[PDB]
Amino acid sequence: GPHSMRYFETAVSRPGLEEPRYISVGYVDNKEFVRFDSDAENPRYEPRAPWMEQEGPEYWERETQKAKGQEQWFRVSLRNLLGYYNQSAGGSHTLQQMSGCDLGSDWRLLRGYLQFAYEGRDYIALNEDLKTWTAADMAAQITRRKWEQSGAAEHYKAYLEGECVEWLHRYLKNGNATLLRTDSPKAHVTHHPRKGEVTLRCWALGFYPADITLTWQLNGEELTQDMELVETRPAGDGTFQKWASVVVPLGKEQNYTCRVYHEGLPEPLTLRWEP
Amino acid sequence: AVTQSPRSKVAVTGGKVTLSCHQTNNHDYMYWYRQDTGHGLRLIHYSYVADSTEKGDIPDGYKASRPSQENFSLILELASLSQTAVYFCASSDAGGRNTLYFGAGTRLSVLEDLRNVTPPKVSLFEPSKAEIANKQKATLVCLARGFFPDHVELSWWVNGKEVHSGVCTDPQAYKESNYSYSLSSRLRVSATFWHNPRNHFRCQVQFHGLSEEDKWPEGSPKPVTQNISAEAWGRAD
Amino acid sequence: KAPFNFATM
Amino acid sequence: QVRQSPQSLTVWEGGTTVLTCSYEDSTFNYFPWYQQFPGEGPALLISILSVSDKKEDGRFTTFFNKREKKLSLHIIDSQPGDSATYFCAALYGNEKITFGAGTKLTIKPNIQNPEPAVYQLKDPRSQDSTLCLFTDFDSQINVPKTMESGTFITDKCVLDMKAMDSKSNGAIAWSNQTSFTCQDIFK
Amino acid sequence: MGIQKTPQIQVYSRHPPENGKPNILNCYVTQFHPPHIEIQMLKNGKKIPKVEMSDMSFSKDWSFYILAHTEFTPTETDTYACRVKHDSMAEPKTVYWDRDM
Structure with missing residues (x-):
């Protein structure tokens, strides 16, 4: 299957004397592995998964220096945007970036990503060709022209096709055992009267990674109506939780089954209300 | 544009010297470099933003001032013979790999x-x-x-x-x-x-x-x- | 390793 | 970290100039060259990323060799107006540029039809002030240096009257002696 | 630009809740923009002092998410809640802990 690396960066300007807050988070296959935060007592990139302990001090020092450069880049970019949009001095504004690569199991780049948002709206993005830009509004046309003129896409392309790919591959080799780790969901169904109707709620607890699917069915057909799902949520101890519910007739509860699909399981779980 | 002032300076040992640089690039980064008998470009001080400065590789004997975005000055409080050299100011955009735009240089001789x-x-x-x-x-x-x-x-x-x-x-x-x-x-x-x-x-x-x-x-x-x-x-x- | 931006916006 | 030799180089007009550089840090991935003319500041000439082997712009080509950690700059049909100091440089990511020490390049013609001669010139605003001009001599000959206090002989200086084809090597000699003939001093 | 998103809030315990047994109460807040947010955890309407905040993250739709948590011991008498202020909403939102959710 594929693999991915992403860096998600945010800079938030602050109306008083403070410089913008700058945070950068790296992910490999959607697992956080490094983080930098300008508000930390000692602002530096830090490992966030145990396999990043293979990197020497040079790695951390130079990545930290890179973040310090990004911090200035974001500061200037925020100030420039303030002018482009004619915004007043004493507000707070958010610039975000997503960058990275998707890599096949043959180590071929499938897609590179380099895009930005301002105030929660898409701003500019590098096209799939890694050569041209899509700009969302008037301000972003200014940026687009500046980057076309300076040849910025060529430099991003080099990062995406070279460094992004090569480092992802190194991280996957060092992180393999950790990246394969799973914790299986523990599941059960609860019963909650609701008018001759009851809510059946199928719980999945203590699972890792977060990816999971819960389904309800009746008489071999998967349900969609009368259904409620909560967003998958952290327990706070590194594992996750989720539930899914259906509203059913009083007296027919046992006819309904919940299925839990998760990569940790040797096969999907099937369960029923069992009072 | 990046323009330096003066074009040339002759100072006495122990005298005060200020070299000035003015840029119209609206660039956040400014730099002062030293060149010796036409070789090298050694970074003395630089600045990432108006109203602050950072030590470069060879700061000793020099100070810097960034009073505005457009201006960056190099200050020698007690000029020494060893500071006879040519000095170049530059600007650049913030970020990575941004081209340095240099001024035309200031030649300084420090004399007894x-x-x-x-x-x-x-x-x-x-x-x-x-x-x-x-x-x-x-x-x-x-x-x-x-x-x-x-x-x-x-x-x-x-x-x-x-x-x-x-x-x-x-x-x-x-x-x-x-x-x-x-x-x-x-x-x-x-x-x-x-x-x-x-x-x-x-x-x-x-x-x-x-x-x-x-x-x-x-x-x-x-x-x-x-x-x-x-x-x-x-x-x- | 992280990306690094070039020209500012 | 960026090693650039030689300090200075002459190559003949029309020849291909080869300038080389090496670097220590194998992670360096961007290599800009800057050109600096006498009396001016450096300016960006050409640059190359480590993903590429070469970059060409007119008469200038940079080549990048990752295995040997070597860069070079080739200038085809080298011409007098390429006379300048060339700085190689290197950086990783968004780190600050590191410059080499710079190579001073002089492009000179190898003169085709030399007709050497020595002349005495007078300063009309002086009582008795004169100098010696050695001109139109072969491009390979060493200009003699002073073997004498109070007499000065300059290095070879090449000019080109671009009116038509009139390139010429020259040197000057003058003295505080009151008995220095120009035929003595240049032989 | 600019597109605001309203926070979605879940209040729940780390472990199955039992009166008199120490536990952790979580307030998970997602899908918000801008990132400026205020989150309190409440006991009987009163701010709980010791509340820890995770690092903030953002999703591929640019929206932010964060976890607030505190030690607690559920009881039959005490109400627990999470209150959130964010510019997408005219007024703060209070979500009461429901031990069945």
């Missing part, structure tokens, strides 16, 4: 005693009749002698216009004694061009010396920055 600063005598030697008759060419020679320090720029002007074709100027001043440099240049024209009395030839030596910042006593001429020229007309002789 400013009474040694002396402008050149400029002499224009007219072409040999032997060259004219045998080669149908006429080489004029300009000699600047007796100047110190060696902050000179020599240019040729024919009929009021600066010329580069037919000129060779010594790349380096010739040191005649401790406090005396010489420089030569030649301009070659055709014999018929030299023989036309409508044609005007001028050797201009731009000497950089003291400035209005320097006090000078009543006794003698102040050896200030100045242009000194020697001239000759063509002649049908």
